[PDB]
From a paper:
The members of the avidin protein family are well known for their high affinity towards d-biotin and their structural stability. In the present study, two avidin-like biotin-binding proteins (named streptavidin C1 and C2) from Streptomyces cinnamonensis were newly identified while exploring antifungal proteins against Fusarium oxysporum f. sp. cucumerinum. Streptavidin C1 reveals a low correlation (a sequence identity of approximately 64%) with all known streptavidins, whereas streptavidin C2 shares a sequence identity of approximately 94% with other streptavidins. Here, the crystal structures of streptavidin C1 in the mature form and in complex with biotin at 2.1 and 2.5 Å resolution, respectively, were assessed.
Similar to other streptavidin family members, four sets of interactions are present in the biotin-binding sites. Firstly, a hydrogen-bonding network with biotin is formed by Asn56, Ser60, Tyr76, Ser78 and Asp160. The second set of interactions comprises hydrophobic interactions between biotin and strictly conserved residues (Leu58 in Loop1–2, Val80 in Loop3–4, Tyr111 in Loop5–6, Trp140 in β7 and Leu142 in β7). Tyr111 in Loop5–6 is a specific novel residue that interacts with d-biotin, and in most proteins of the (strept)avidin family this position is occupied by a tryptophan residue, except for tamavidin, which has a phenylalanine at this position. We did not find electron density for the ECP and C-Lid regions when biotin was bound to the protein, which indicates that these regions are flexible but do not affect the binding ability of biotin. d of biotin binding to recombinant streptavidin C1 was about 3.06 ± 0.498 pM. r value of streptavidin C1 is lower than that of streptavidin C2 and the reported values for streptavidin, bradavidin and tamavidin. Moreover, streptavidins C1 and C2 with d-biotin exhibited thermal stability even at 100°C and mostly remained in the tetrameric form [Supplementary Figs. S3(c) and S3(d)].
Author numbering:
A (entry chain A), B (entry chain A), C (entry chain A), D (entry chain A): 48 to 167
């Protein structure tokens, strides 16, 4: 797959893929912004047989509660791994907070992250 | 957490949460629409300590390649589990295909899924 | 086109289409939630020749500053008008606030609105 | 406001703002990709009183039917205008096609566009 190890997005966040096999992967995520500190568990999936000439579809989930802090939010990234230098993971993400039924309408943020091997 | 077992969204898709503990959960996803057949691996996260009076933020990833088929796409759902009948998981999802660099602009679909215990 | 007049979404918000012709339409939007009060200008577009058997693609923009208040946010809805009772406009929307460069990552909310002729 | 004139996004698309006043603006949009050719009408809104130190929230709609072609789709951009060189409009967009009720789930694409004064 080629995603093993450390990645950095344009915010200085740190994604560490510690294991990847059979279309699934695991690791840690450390966000440089927002209500977060130290590392959070990360689990995701990837296309283990990408079509020739295309990127490798990926996706992963991060619940932003560790033993130090809980923002009560879950983020998910969806995009594709693009090989050949510059290698990059281009994503769009959803950040959803647990809310009351009256506040569901404002429960989800949307953004996009670009991950690279070298910290920007 | 309360998400164990079978869920159905408004499309007739089937989400089976087979294990859930310590802020992470696993299972299968079977999509009633699109380029899919049989079951696909599912992995995700959830807020294991939701604030009082709010929903439980969730999120999960499904790579749509099993041993029968590969759509070369990865989907991620992000939202919250709402307890108290009617119990429901309200989500918004991203479906991203592996593409060529010329086609990245049209690589991601966006939608929203509402999951319930009873099939609609 | 068939969108002239008053619409209500699932939040009790009020959309009034005052004119619609030649693929463009105008009106007012009154949001029942968030930092808003009274009416805001609304401008949008629609497919003036929808394919047979399909819905009519629509889209409109609302800057949430009137002469009474300014939330410093702009919302856009994108979806389709579906004819035949029950007539409905199904949408997904983006709400973007003006921010500092350090806060761009959390500048946009995402949701979905379903509009109907009768207030829910 | 400062958005008058020609803009280019990272795809080579051309956005021409022909008039802008009182929180609303108009113009043309020419997309370098997808089912499009020549120019399409564009209408949108902007925050006419942005908070000090922040960007100017914007948003606009483009129905992709001109007198030459109809893709049966409507796109909307939502984001903010950032002043001070490099001036830029950062956006996230929704592209929604008119569909049958069975195909609504796959009716909307999601992406992000960055517009600049100089064509990339
Ligand atoms: O504030 C929170 O609720 C927890 C931190 C959220 C950080 C978000 S998650 C998506 C985006 N990309 C990042 O690397 N960080 C932000
Ligand atoms: O067509 C594909 O690429 C694979 C099937 C995708 C099914 C999507 S995933 C999100 C949405 N919700 C569902 O239950 N099914 C569709
Ligand atoms: O709080 C603000 O920034 C202004 C009010 C925003 C209301 C949003 S716009 C999209 C969603 N749908 C509605 O009818 N209201 C909310
Ligand atoms: O293919 C279509 O349905 C019409 C052309 C769509 C072009 C899209 S709209 C959003 C994105 N940004 C662009 O400048 N072009 C694409």
């Amino acid at each position: 797959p080629g995603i093993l190890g450390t990645w950095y997005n344009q915010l200085g966040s740190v994604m560490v893929v510690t294991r990847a096999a059979n279309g699934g992967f695991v690791g840690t995520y450390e966000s440089a912004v927002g209500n977060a500190e130290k590392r959070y568990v990360m689990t995701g999936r990837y296309d283990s047989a990408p079509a020739d000439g295309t990127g490798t579809a990926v996706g992963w989930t991060v619940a932003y509660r560790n033993a130090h802090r809980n923002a009560h939010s879950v983020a998910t990234w969806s995009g594709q791994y693009v090989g050949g230098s510059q290698e990059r993971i281009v994503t769009q993400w959803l950040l959803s907070y647990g809310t009351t039924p009256a506040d569901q309408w404002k429960s989800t943020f949307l953004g996009h992250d670009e991950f690279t091997r070298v910290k920007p």
